[PDB]
Design a protein around this ligand. Structure first.
Ligand code: CHL
Ligand code: CHL
Ligand code: CHL
Ligand code: CHL
Ligand code: CHL
Ligand code: CHL
Ligand code: CHL
Ligand code: CHL
Ligand code: CHL
Ligand SMILES: CC(/C=C/C=C(C)/C=C/[C@@]12O[C@]1(C)C[C@@H](O)CC2(C)C)=C\C=C\C=C(C)\C=C\C=C(C)\C=C\[C@@]12O[C@]1(C)C[C@@H](O)CC2(C)C
Lengths: 231, 234, 41, 216
């Protein structure tokens, strides 16, 4: 790109502005080969959008249910009270995993076949009239862009997407490390910092791993660890 | 052509001449052409046997809900003979009949058109056909064209092969018949799948026990009934 | 490897290997069958 | 050229990349002689295939034993358990049967190495084409390759050859690890893996007792 990640540095010869959010940042040179660069661009796009949805979900769940730790949201009793069927309607998490596994296997194999060969799985397999335009890799469109917001400046809104996604990824890492260090949600952490800035910051919580070593979820024991050896 | 993975590439040894050719050969098992013909015959006979078996299991579970199809040999009728050793005569009769008919089919495969004549009545003769599709007296009526019916046959046969594998594995993990397992899945969809009662994580593994006994006493023979690779179950 | 095997084929190396084998065979025979004085079993 | 075992170092000049798994690794130059190289290639293939079969037959029964389904004894005790549970089958008779059967098949393999295609003359029960041999250490044919995975395409054969040699080397290293872990812990390999998975910060080679003989 033109504006680079640091003053005085030079961009690599393979990074000069095809992609959005190009700051010429590849210190390890992982995108030196174009096939690897395409694969890592797909990975960055899906990581950015998943972190985007995750930050939105973590922030919204603390508004609606502030009393539920998002780190403990996988616990069966932290689930919303809904009927899953059977004698009692309780969750089982096996069928819950099975639903997501089947649906995501289908959709991610579709995306993978798109990544391997461009414009190879654009057509709907059942109703062959339906079609996806797919102007660029990672940007399918069609029913994925119903409001047609990409008809204008595609590069500008792509830059907005990738920059917000990078911010969301950094924010999700912050969410996880803060939840592991404090045992509280992100907005609770923000309120604690706003209450006592010099008495409650990273220097008072980084040595502690507030997450328990293991948890028991309906008959099985999932081992747990922090991202650093806290106690 | 229709590919098992749309957008992919079919291997060069699967042109599309065979019925049900969707380009599925990731291991390259059919890359040898004579091996491809032998495996086509094997797929046809496996498909037909699995079709008959799945239909029989479903019917004899509907007709007799009190008889487990896995255990159906222990409670099978004995219309021939007054001795418990009459099973060996039925085994001998079946072995003779299947040896005859399978030698006829095999020598049709190796020598096409050689086994087209009735060995008893020389006037009766099967018309000229393709290998693996006899026709003639075997197909008195053909409701439609041959190619689409062959595609339907191979699709239903593959579905029946998968269904028989499912019948076997569900019999091991539940000790009960197919439609009873279907009803139990319909009663509690979230807590009856294989993902429900089987979980393996790096910490521990939960493996469901198999309800079929390890052996049975059939007139003093002690027939072993091992659960199929139950140590490798999730 | 050819030159190394040619060195192992020289007379002192072959003598060392052969006499090690023969001496070891005699030692292990006298270990498994201690004190053989006569051909009697 | 190709990828090598030590990047920046030239491959061994007697290794030109034709053989499967050629990473130019011969620091002692043991494969300089081409005939000795063919002999060592057969040695590596036989060792790797034996190691692959052995590691599977150690691991899958031990995985099944860890799940509690069966009580198959550990690999270091299975000979004793078999002898104690089979009094009517003496050890010497079993060894004699194994020696004559392995001697038959290995003498056939040896005589094929000495003169390739020589076992294809129909002397063994009329077997002619299946004993001809495709390459050195790769017999093939309808008997040894009944699915025809080597007769389909050349690139498929080279890919499967690379798979075979790399999994064989991995299995040989794994069997060495089996020996070293049994000598250090006194337990099976799946038992060692389960102990490591239970608490990996304290279940290490540094805590078994024999890899570090000092107290520490
Ligand atoms: C993918 C997104 C995702 C993320 C970031 C999390 C994050 C978390 N979950 Mg959650 N979950 C996620 C998806 C899901 N969870 C759950 C259900 C649960 C439960 C029941 C629990 C959690 C817990 C946790 C927390 C502790 C994780 C841990 O340390 O275990 C250690 C991690 C491992 C031992 C490995 C876990 C994944 C690993 C990265 C490999 C990925 C698995 C692959 C499929 C492996 C492939 C297997 C092959 C060989 C067949 C953490 C906040 C626990 C918690 O702390 O709550 C108090 C908890 O008890 N989650 C379901 C089921 C609907 C999910 C669906 O995708
Ligand atoms: C035996 C099957 C079975 C039965 C009788 C129920 C029962 C019910 N569930 Mg449940 N579920 C069942 C299987 C499963 N469900 C779910 C996941 C859900 C969710 C997420 C929700 C229900 C909800 C409902 C209600 C929907 C009524 C409605 O107005 O829909 C139209 C109904 C009482 C809803 C409810 O609990 O409150 C509105 C709801 O939000 N089910 C899963 C996992 C995908 C199942 C397997
Ligand atoms: C080169 C930097 C550096 C290294 C190698 C360590 C090493 C360690 N510190 Mg320390 N520290 C370091 C810089 C700093 N630390 C701390 C504040 C603490 C606390 C409050 C604690 C540790 C603790 C620990 C131990 C457990 C790991 C941990 O808590 O991660 C901390 C990770 C960071 C600080 C990332 C930066 C580990 C031996 C713990 C200990 O003393 O006993 C287990 C503990 O409670 N560190 C601050 C002020 C914010 C630093 C600057
Ligand atoms: C591959 C073919 C095939 C085989 C090996 C079997 C096997 C068996 N069936 Mg099943 N079936 C088969 C196809 C079919 N069956 C059935 C419907 C039934 C019924 C209704 C019954 C059997 C029964 C039996 C048993 C005794 C049969 C007998 O005595 O016949 C002698 C002539 C035997 C275990 C009987 C039983 O003992 O098990 C429940 C029984 O009552 N089969 C249908 C639909 C018509 C099929 C097609
Ligand atoms: C080349 C001569 C030679 C021959 C024919 C044998 C023969 C034998 N050694 Mg012997 N050894 C020989 C040289 C040497 N060995 C040994 C050290 C051993 C040991 C430690 C053992 C043998 C054993 C054996 C027996 C089984 C292998 C077999 C009788 C084994 C045995 O005695 O019975 C199984 C056994 O445990 N050898 C050393 C080192 C000093 C040698 C030089
Ligand atoms: C020509 C002189 C001479 C003769 C005829 C013998 C003869 C014998 N010595 Mg004496 N030795 C002789 C010189 C010397 N010895 C010894 C030191 C010893 C010792 C210390 C021992 C003998 C023993 C033996 C006996 C070995 C039998 C045997 O191993 O069968 C084995 C037969 C074969 C290997 C034949 C080959 C079969 C093939 C492998 C198949 C045999 C009676 C041993 C014996 O116990 O005393 C009676 C004994 O312990 N010798 C020294 C000093 C190094 C000598 C010089
Ligand atoms: C290198 C290959 C290899 C070797 C040397 C062994 C060695 C052994 N295995 Mg293993 N296995 C091997 C590959 C594999 N095994 C297994 C799965 C098992 C199991 C599940 C068991 C063994 C057992 C045994 C032992 C008794 C063998 C026996 O009774 O034969 C019986 C041979 C016949 C009956 C003849 C074969 C028929 C032939 C055509 C005539 C013996 C120590 C048993 C045990 O651990 O101790 C008793 C046992 O339970 N193996 C798998 C999968 C393999 C791949
Ligand atoms: C070449 C492969 C091979 C290897 C590495 C081993 C090695 C072993 N054997 Mg085995 N054997 C092998 C092939 C064979 N073994 C045996 C027959 C036995 C028996 C009968 C016994 C062993 C035992 C043992 C184990 C302990 C030996 C020991 O010193 O205990 C110290 C050890 C794992 C034994 C053991 O566990 O001791 C208690 C045991 O009793 N082996 C046969 C006969 C068919 C083999 C065929 O090639
Ligand atoms: C990773 C394992 C592995 C792989 C990829 C190969 C690959 C090959 N083998 Mg080898 N082998 C392997 C393990 C072993 N082989 C052999 C013994 C032989 C012989 C005697 C011959 C070959 C031949 C071949 C070639 C053609 C057959 C084929 O493609 O199989 C593809 C393999 C797979 C697709 C993997 C199958 C996995 C298997 C289902 C797992 C079973 C686990 C059970 C516990 C056992 C190809 C180079 C032929 C030849 O060398 O070339 C002309 C031939 O004649 N192999 C043994 C000893 C029994 C092994 C262990
Ligand atoms: C590790 C190994 C080989 C290692 C050698 C190496 C690295 C050589 C490297 C080099 O040469 C090169 C390439 C080039 C040179 O310039 C330099 C060096 C560096 C010298 C072989 C192991 C190979 C290991 C093998 C063959 C394994 C087979 C074992 C069997 C059959 C076990 C059977 C059983 O275990 C069961 C199955 C069940 C049990 O109950 C009973 C029993 C009977 C015990």
């Amino acid at each position: 790109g033109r504006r680079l990640w640091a003053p005085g540095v030079e961009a690599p010869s393979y990074l000069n502005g095809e992609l959005a959010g190009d700051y010429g940042w590849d210190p390890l040179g992982l995108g030196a080969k174009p096939e690897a660069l395409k694969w890592y661009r797909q990975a960055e796009l899906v990581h950015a959008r998943w972190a985007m949805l995750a930050v939105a979900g973590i922030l919204a769940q603390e508004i609606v249910k502030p009393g539920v730790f998002f780190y403990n949201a996988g616990l069966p009793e932290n689930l919303p009270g809904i009927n899953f069927g059977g004698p009692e309607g309780k969750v089982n998490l096996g069928g819950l995993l099975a639903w997501e596994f089947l649906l995501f296997h289908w959709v991610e194999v579709r995306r993978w076949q798109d990544i391997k060969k461009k414009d190879s799985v654009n057509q709907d397999p059942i109703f062959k009239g339906n079609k996806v335009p797919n102007p660029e890799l990672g940007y399918p469109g069609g029913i994925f862009d119903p409001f047609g917001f990409s008809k204008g400046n595609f590069k500008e809104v792509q830059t907005k997407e990738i920059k917000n996604g990078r911010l969301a990824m950094v924010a999700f890492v912050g969410f996880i490390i803060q939840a592991q260090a404090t045992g509280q949600g992100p907005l609770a952490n923000l309120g604690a910092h706003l209450a006592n800035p010099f008495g409650n910051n990273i220097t008072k919580n980084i040595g502690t791993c507030a997450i328990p070593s293991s948890v028991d979820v309906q008959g099985i024991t999932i081992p747990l660890t922090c991202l650093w050896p806290g106690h | 052509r229709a590919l098992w993975l749309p957008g992919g590439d079919a291997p060069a040894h699967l042109d599309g001449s065979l019925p049900g050719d969707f380009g599925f050969d990731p291991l390259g098992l059919g890359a040898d052409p004579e091996r491809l013909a032998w495996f086509a015959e094997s797929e046809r006979v496996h498909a037909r046997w699995a079709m008959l078996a799945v239909a029989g299991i479903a019917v004899q579970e509907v007709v007799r809900p009190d008889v487990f199809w896995y255990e159906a040999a222990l409670k099978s009728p004995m219309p021939f003979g007054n001795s418990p050793a009459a099973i060996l005569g039925l085994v001998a009769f079946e072995l003779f009949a299947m040896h005859f008919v399978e030698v006829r089919r095999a020598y049709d495969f190796k020598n096409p058109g050689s086994q087209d004549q009735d060995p008893i009545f020389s006037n009766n003769k099967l018309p000229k056909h393709e290998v693996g599709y006899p026709g003639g007296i075997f197909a008195p009526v053909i409701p439609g064209d041959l190619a689409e019916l062959k595609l339907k046959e191979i699709k239903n046969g593959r579905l029946a092969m998968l269904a028989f594998a499912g019948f076997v594995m569900q019999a091991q993990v539940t000790g009960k018949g197919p439609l009873a397992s279907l009803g139990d899945h319909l009663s509690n969809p979230i807590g009856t799948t294989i993902f429900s009662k089987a979980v393996v994580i790096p910490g521990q593994a939960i493996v469901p026990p198999c309800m079929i006994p390890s052996s049975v006493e059939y007139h003093g023979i002690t027939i072993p009934t091992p659960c199929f690779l139950s140590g490798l179950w999730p | 490897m050819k030159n190394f095997t040619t060195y192992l084929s020289t007379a002192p190396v072959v003598a060392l290997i052969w006499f090690t084998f023969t001496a070891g065979l005699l030692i292990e025979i006298n270990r498994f069958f201690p004190d053989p004085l006569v051909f009697s079993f | 050229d190709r990828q090598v075992w030590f990047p920046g170092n030239a491959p061994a000049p007697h290794l030109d990349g034709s053989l499967p798994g050629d990473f130019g690794f011969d620091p002692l130059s043991l494969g300089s002689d081409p005939q000795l190289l063919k002999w060592f290639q057969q040695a590596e293939l036989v060792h790797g295939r034996t190691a692959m079969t052995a590691v599977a037959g150690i691991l899958f029964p031990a995985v099944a034993t860890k799940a509690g389904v069966v009580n198959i004894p550990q690999w270091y005790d299975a000979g004793s358990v078999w002898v104690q549970n089979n009094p009517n089958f003496p050890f010497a008779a079993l060894l004699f049967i194994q020696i004559i059967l392995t001697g038959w098949v290995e003498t056939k393999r040896w005589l094929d190495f000495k003169n390739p295609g020589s076992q294809a003359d129909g002397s063994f029960l009329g077997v002619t084409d299946d004993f001809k041999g495709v390459a050195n250490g790769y017999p093939g044919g309808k008997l040894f390759d009944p699915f025809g995975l080597s007769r389909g395409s050349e690139g498929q054969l080279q890919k499967y050859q690379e798979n075979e040699i790399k999994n064989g080397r991995l299995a040989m290293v794994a069997f060495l690890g089996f020996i070293a872990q049994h000598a250090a812990t006194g337990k099976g390999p799946i038992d060692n893996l389960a102990d490591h998975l239970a608490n990996p910060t304290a279940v290490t080679f540094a805590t078994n007792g024999v890899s570090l003989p000092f107290v520490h």
